[PDB]
Subunit: 282 residues, 4 copies
């Protein structure tokens, strides 16, 4: 059983300990649930105002007296500011409620618009993670590697990547805890990430996986968490992406196949079909 999902999530059941977190909930519900809630408020509030018009007499011209249907659509046409002409307020009481309803609709529209904007303008990084990792020799040291690819043409600037080892360990006192280890990389910052980025961790005497083998990583239930962050030119916003690997997904001795190929014309090309391809010696 893996403690981190492939997408970077945690696979832990939350035991624990309708308006205490209203701003969060309105942003995280699905769009159908969101559109439903907005429609609800839109109707409930109109009904309320419709009842406020009947509670002061027949103050709506060309409206069947005491008819809720005719009063509702007058509220609709008032809150929306359509103002057809047939239905119109008469009497100082109705005109004051109209004044209030218009204010209430503007304030509610601004809140709904704020939430729509906040939900809609959530960019995705468009970054692809290698399905596996590898441990092969690079510059004379065994090196843990994975790689990233930009699925869009627009570039990502000040791109950062963080490679975390997650394994169970035993302290000097004998306490069995789960520790996170920041793994030093040859390059943790790519100022302009455009195409493909091979991320490397030299396994030297300082590495927390020095001397480890395929077996020891399983016994410690080792996992590898990857976080990517950058500023996407397409959106002019920051983006991020997360991924996680299990020890079973490290191909020892593997080499990532070059995704850069030379066309017959001499043009340098990027073939992402080889992105997950790994060469093994037998």
């Amino acid at each position: 059983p893996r403690i981190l999902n492939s997408d970077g999530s945690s696979n832990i059941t939350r035991l624990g300990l309708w308006l205490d977190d209203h701003y969060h909930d309105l942003l995280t519900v699905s769009w159908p649930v969101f559109i439903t809630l907005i429609t609800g408020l839109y109707l409930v509030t109109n009904a309320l105002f419709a009842l406020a018009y009947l509670a002061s007499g027949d103050v709506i011209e060309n409206a069947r007296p005491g008819s809720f249907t005719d009063a509702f659509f007058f509220s609709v046409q008032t809150m929306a500011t359509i103002g057809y002409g047939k239905l119109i307020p008469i009497g100082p009481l109705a005109n004051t409620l109209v004044t209030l309803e218009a204010l209430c609709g503007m304030l509610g529209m601004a809140v709904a618009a704020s939430l729509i904007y906040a939900r809609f303008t959530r960019p995705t990084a468009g970054v692809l993670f290698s399905s596996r990792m590898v441990i092969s020799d690079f510059e004379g040291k065994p090196t843990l590697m994975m790689r990233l690819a930009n699925l869009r043409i627009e570039q990502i600037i000040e791109a950062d990547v963080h490679l975390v080892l997650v394994r169970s360990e035993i302290s000097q006192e004998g306490m069995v805890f789960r520790r996170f280890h920041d793994l030093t990389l040859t390059r943790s910052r790519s100022p302009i990430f455009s195409l493909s980025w091979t991320v490397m961790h030299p396994i030297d005497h300082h590495s927390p996986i020095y001397g480890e083998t395929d077996e020891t990583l399983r016994n410690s239930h080792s996992e590898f968490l990857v976080l990517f962050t950058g500023h996407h030119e397409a959106f002019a916003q920051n983006v991020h992406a997360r991924h996680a690997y299990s020890s079973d997904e490290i191909i020892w001795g593997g080499h990532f196949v070059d995704v850069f190929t030379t066309l017959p014309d001499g043009r340098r090309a990027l073939d992402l079909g080889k992105f997950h391809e790994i060469a093994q010696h037998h």
Copy 2:
């Protein structure tokens, strides 16, 4: 008397030295005060325009001449853009004021909407601080600890924590000042904060609390300030949270009870009911 409140605020009375800070004030007033101010401008400006229509003659059809009530609701129906039909401008003077009023309402609506958005889209971190701290041995050193918990399912990426010692000290010259000490942590950056995070400060010869005891921390009036910062996936915005501890809230020899429990099914679980539980030896 504590100099920092539990929530991270300062407990200092500001001796010191209605429009000099209008943007700040409009964002910091309570919602009832905010809604009240907006309603005020909404009525005052309409009244002003209503008086601008009477100051040019009876230029409102179906409106009692010189009646402010009928002129006000015409301004309302004009600023809001309802445009029922009974009340309508007549004469080039009224139609020019209508043109101005519509412009004034759009500009005011945009400012009101900007403020609403700015006030509404203020996410909260949803982070829980341990009620106490502890000082127990970890990896062979006495270690100061507290811990954090994410009260939501959505993860927080690039989470940072900063642990500051605040105590009165005496310089070589004899000046008694209050100094802030950044306390080095085993982990100050958690790339993906999902569940629980135990923060640790090894008390070695470099620590500003090396050799200190429960008594010395009180005599120096020592306090501990904690700041948390991260990027919350739920909101796609940054969040932060602050907390402060007094020396009286350090449980020497204490150990935080594990909040990770193993269910009978083998599923890993998170029980936040034990989050504030601390084990003491007697």
Copy 3:
């Protein structure tokens, strides 16, 4: 003649080398100029549409034929979406222009609103700089100092300060250039800036002002640039503030008077009236 103004600006005349920078210009013009430009577009575009209605015949009911005045206010009432009733489109040509005008007004309103929001939501740090600096002994070293004060109750988190020396220097080749020197501080990051922050630069053998005197700083035309940055809780946005000092504004041997005073009640207080006070020995 000083090369940096007290507010951090540069005092250099730009020799150099109406729509090439439209987004910048619309954000930087004064509000009167901005409101004027928006009003302009609002009238010009309405006039244009008014001429588009006459160029297709008398397609406006209750409108004097060929009258521009009556056609303009119909465009106003259409672009604003008031729709009184007297003036109404007749014929497929007018109704198509109405359809276009409504689209054009919505698109223009969205751009105007975007600019209003972008201009309006520009918070100010509310930070006060000490009028002078000082060089006195602290912890056994001559230390350059200034201090900052938060003029608001809301706190600023992850506050950074940067102290830059700016002076003319001569390279080994003999080139006379103006170099910026980052001055190391005892604390460059205050995780929670609430009240007052004394910023200190120990003048040791590593400092670029080691061995300098009041005279040498003038001969080199030394200046000191200060930048402050933080995340203001009042606005939930980042803020910054800049200041610059001349050598003539360093009080050698000076000590900033404590702004923290003890009231008779035992409450700790902050008296910003002493913020610019400096003690000198004679």
Copy 4:
């Protein structure tokens, strides 16, 4: 053939591997294509509603029965909330569709406004890169240099620059890959970038171009990538700019001509006409 364009882009053909990326596409299409798509939805949705009114009978007063033209403009006047008066809904079915259409238009307007804002508020850094680089002696070491200029009066705070060497290299195993080298600079952070900034890389034993010549940089196909980032006061947003140089654009022995000149009045001036001027010895 150069692998990086002068503007920092990559010159690689993407081989690869209409709604899968809708938010990205709507932000990256040209304004004519964007305005066209918005106009499309604006008409298609109105047509749909127009057909929803005919599919329930002649429920539009003063509208030719079964006429799509008259029903379309009623939808327009309803979605836009103009509400002239001639065309008006009759029957509970039409008034319910009107209620729905108004809701649909508000929701669509909010999405369109969000996209407009997101597209419009994309500031440009206004930064100028030197057309060439140089390698001359500075402080006793051969130093690689280029420089930047602020084309606007407003200052940029916390300005960062990153200089990356890009060249083909051979690992100990014999693998021919393209490596990025972060080049250490005398100053990588300018807290307040106002005028001109000469960026310098001392070529010492640590530099990856130590011992290299004009010939060796070509044989390795060396290129130099520059990224600039800062917070622009004009916009209160972050900005960035990228540039790339080829080995053919390094002027060995060159010196950038001083852009700071002394006027006859003693005022310090900035002449950006000399910004690309470089002095060579013969």
